[PDB]
Design an enzyme around this catalytic site. Sequence first.
Site, PDB file in Angstrom:
ATOM      1  N   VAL A   1      -7.369   8.547   4.118  1.00  0.00           N
ATOM      2  CA  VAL A   1      -7.257   7.051   4.151  1.00  0.00           C
ATOM      3  C   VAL A   1      -7.602   6.528   5.545  1.00  0.00           C
ATOM      4  CG1 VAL A   1      -5.513   7.102   2.340  1.00  0.00           C
ATOM      5  CG2 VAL A   1      -4.783   6.958   4.718  1.00  0.00           C
TER       6      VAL A   1
ATOM      7  N   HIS B   1      -2.656  -2.161   8.224  1.00  0.00           N
ATOM      8  CA  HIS B   1      -3.811  -2.607   7.418  1.00  0.00           C
ATOM      9  C   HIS B   1      -4.367  -1.387   6.730  1.00  0.00           C
ATOM     10  CE1 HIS B   1      -7.817  -4.334   6.536  1.00  0.00           C
ATOM     11  NE2 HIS B   1      -8.347  -3.312   7.247  1.00  0.00           N
TER      12      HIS B   1
ATOM     13  N   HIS C   1       0.792  -1.263   0.000  1.00  0.00           N
ATOM     14  CA  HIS C   1       0.000   0.000   0.000  1.00  0.00           C
ATOM     15  C   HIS C   1       0.806   1.286   0.000  1.00  0.00           C
ATOM     16  CE1 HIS C   1      -3.483  -2.328   0.550  1.00  0.00           C
ATOM     17  NE2 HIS C   1      -3.019  -2.866   1.680  1.00  0.00           N
TER      18      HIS C   1
ATOM     19  N   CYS D   1      -6.014   0.096  -7.891  1.00  0.00           N
ATOM     20  CA  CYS D   1      -5.892  -0.928  -8.954  1.00  0.00           C
ATOM     21  C   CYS D   1      -7.063  -1.882  -8.796  1.00  0.00           C
ATOM     22  CB  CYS D   1      -4.529  -1.612  -8.856  1.00  0.00           C
ATOM     23  SG  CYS D   1      -3.158  -0.419  -8.905  1.00  0.00           S
TER      24      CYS D   1
ATOM     25  N   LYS E   1      -5.033  -9.986  -6.769  1.00  0.00           N
ATOM     26  CA  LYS E   1      -5.837  -9.221  -5.777  1.00  0.00           C
ATOM     27  C   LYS E   1      -6.893  -8.408  -6.539  1.00  0.00           C
ATOM     28  CE  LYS E   1      -5.012  -6.719  -1.406  1.00  0.00           C
ATOM     29  NZ  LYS E   1      -3.974  -6.141  -0.517  1.00  0.00           N
TER      30      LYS E   1
ATOM     31  N   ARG F   1       0.156   7.132 -13.221  1.00  0.00           N
ATOM     32  CA  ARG F   1      -0.693   6.276 -12.352  1.00  0.00           C
ATOM     33  C   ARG F   1      -1.831   5.708 -13.204  1.00  0.00           C
ATOM     34  NH1 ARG F   1      -1.108  10.999  -8.225  1.00  0.00           N
ATOM     35  NH2 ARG F   1      -2.963   9.838  -7.525  1.00  0.00           N
ATOM     36  N   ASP F   2      -1.452   5.103 -14.342  1.00  0.00           N
ATOM     37  CA  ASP F   2      -2.347   4.583 -15.415  1.00  0.00           C
ATOM     38  C   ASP F   2      -2.498   3.065 -15.254  1.00  0.00           C
ATOM     39  OD1 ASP F   2       0.353   4.162 -16.316  1.00  0.00           O
ATOM     40  OD2 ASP F   2      -0.210   4.364 -18.428  1.00  0.00           O
TER      41      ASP F   2
HETATM   42  N   LIG Z   1      -4.139  -6.496   6.599  1.00  0.00           N
HETATM   43 PT   LIG Z   2      -5.256  -5.837   5.242  1.00  0.00          PT
END
Ligand SMILES: [N]
Ligand SMILES: [Pt+2]
Length: 122
Positions: free
Chosen positions: A103, A114, A13, A81, A40, A21-22
């Site tokens: 965020v 996380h 992350h 993504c 993912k 950022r394509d």
């Molecule tokens: N996580």
């Molecule tokens: Pt997570």
Amino acid sequence: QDNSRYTHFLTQHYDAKPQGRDDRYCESIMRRRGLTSPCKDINTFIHGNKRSIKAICENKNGNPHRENLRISKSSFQVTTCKLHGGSPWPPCQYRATAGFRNVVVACENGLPVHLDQSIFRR
Ligand SMILES: [N]
Ligand SMILES: [Pt+2]
């Protein structure tokens, strides 16, 4: 001093200065960070300075949020993504959405461990 969940958060992350950022960016960085076996379905990267992300875990850059989470005071450049198709297995095609907002993370021992992907589902 076990910072393994923190360093894994940065791998999944954090991308300090991404350039473009394509879709191409998403397909390459998801492979680089090991998030394609299996693919993912959604993954968001936070850009900018590491220290501001860490600071979400303090009252300096965070508020308590829902049951166990924290939401940042500052807005971050982000890239979501989203998996396109089809198959859980590579090759993994991704649509990029570039954004700028606060965020939500979980903190342990003053480090983010996380990211709550739900605010990026949209
Ligand atoms: N996580
Ligand atoms: Pt997570």
